[PDB]
């Protein structure tokens, strides 16, 4: 039915919004509501400006907690396991930057974020840092070697896919590659023979394995990459 608006919408960093109540309850508290990646979070605050803590629970039982700083300059979005204390992920966002920290210690860092949503991206992994760009569509981290560019894409849902392009002026030495989304594996081909598989693991590591001289089967064992140089060597 027709009704009084009992909340105001407040703008936060990273195009987030929070609804805060116009008046306080008997405990002196203002009600807060926000929708974050399709989950409605709710909380109460002793401030009237939109700052405070909101909580929600995902379908898989994980606990979500959003902390909005007093001056509205920063937001922290934590996801915990159903125990409410084992941290799965933490994303901290301000005007112009954001950092996502994973359970395994790796981070995605976004800086210089522009009015169109684009910016610089860095993925801090064990042993090395991958850099690239953020757009409103996705994050792309690149490694380059000669005329080859390897591109690791991360979708807005966190899904990883990889692609390779080679501007080599010689057809015979040009690298091409195909991605297998079921195995998160990139297979590189040169001169009509598969040469190596780059496996992007669930542990945020990469492994490399060579094919035999005929391109018909993998040989040896997969080697875990620990250095950026090893990725560049794979692209030679
Ligand atoms: Mg290709």
Topology:
Layout: E1 7-12, E2 16-21, E3 30-36, E4 39-45, E5 52-57, E6 63-68, E7 74-80, E8 87-94, E9 97-102, E10 107-111, E11 119-124, E12 129-134, E13 138-145, E14 148-155, E15 160-166, E16 175-180, E17 185-190, E18 193-200, E19 206-210, E20 223-224, H1 228-234
Antiparallel strand pairs: 1-2, 2-3, 3-4, 5-6, 6-7, 7-8, 8-9, 9-10, 10-11, 11-12, 12-13, 13-14, 14-15, 16-17, 17-18, 18-19, 19-20
The protein binds magnesium ion.
GO cellular component, one term: cell outer membrane
Pfam family, one: Lipoprotein_1
Keywords: Cell outer membrane, Lipoprotein, Membrane, Palmitate, Signal
Describe the protein.
The structure is a monomer. With 236 residues, the protein is an all-beta fold. It folds into two domains: 6-95, Lipocalin; 96-236, Outer Surface Protein A, domain 3, CATH 3.90.930.1. The protein is 3% helix and 53% strand. The chain has one helix spanning 228-234, and strands at 7-12, 16-21, 30-36, 39-45, 52-57, 63-68, 74-80, 87-94, 97-102, 107-111, 119-124, 129-134, 138-145, 148-155, 160-166, 175-180, 185-190, 193-200, 206-210, 223-224. It has an eleven-stranded antiparallel beta sheet, covered by helices on one side. The longest helix is centred in the last third of the chain and has 7 residues, at 228-234. It is elongated. The structure holds magnesium ion. Residues 164-165, 176-177 line the site of magnesium ion.
């Amino acid at each position: 039915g027709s009704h009084m608006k009992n909340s105001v919408s407040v703008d936060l960093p990273g195009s987030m919004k929070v609804l805060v109540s116009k008046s306080s309850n008997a405990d002196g508290k203002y009600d807060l509501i926000a929708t974050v990646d399709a989950l409605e979070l709710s909380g109460t605050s002793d401030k009237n400006n939109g700052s405070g803590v909101l909580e929600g629970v995902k379908a898989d039982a994980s606990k979500v907690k959003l902390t909005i700083s007093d001056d509205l300059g920063q937001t922290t979005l934590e996801v915990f396991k159903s125990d409410g204390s084992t941290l799965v992920s933490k994303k901290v966002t301000s005007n112009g930057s954001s950092t996502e920290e994973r359970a395994d210690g790796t981070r995605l860092e976004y800086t210089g974020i522009k009015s169109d949503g684009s910016g610089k991206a860095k993925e801090v992994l064990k042993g090395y840092v991958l850099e690239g760009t953020l757009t409103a569509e996705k994050t792309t981290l690149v490694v380059k070697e000669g005329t080859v560019t390897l591109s690791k894409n991360i979708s807005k849902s966190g899904e990883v896919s990889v692609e390779l392009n080679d501007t080599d002026s010689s057809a015979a030495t040009k690298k091409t590659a195909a991605w297998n989304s079921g195995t998160s594996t990139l297979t590189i081909t040169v001169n009509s023979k598969k040469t190596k598989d780059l496996v992007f693991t669930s542990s945020n590591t990469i492994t490399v394995q060579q094919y035999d001289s005929n391109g018909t089967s993998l040989e040896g064992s997969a080697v875990e990459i620990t250095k950026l140089d090893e990725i560049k060597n794979a692209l030679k």
